[PDB]
Amino acid sequence: GEEELAEKAPEFARELANY
């Protein structure tokens, strides 16, 4: 998970959440 999380960084969700 850590790597998926590392390959994710829950800030991307918001970085696209706006678009």
Task: Tell me how the structure was determined.
Answer: NMR
Cα–Cα distance measured from residue 7 to residue 13, given in angstroms and rounded to the nearest whole number? 12
9: phi then psi, degrees, rounded to nearest 5: 60, 85
At 8 the three-state DSSP class reads coil
Residue 14's Cβ-side half-sphere holds a number of Cα atoms within 13 Å equal to 3
Task: Say how far residue 14 (Cα) sits from the centre of its chain.
Answer: 8
CA angle 10, 7, 5 (to 5 degrees): 50
Cα–Cα distance measured from residue 2 to residue 11, given in angstroms and rounded to the nearest whole number? 15
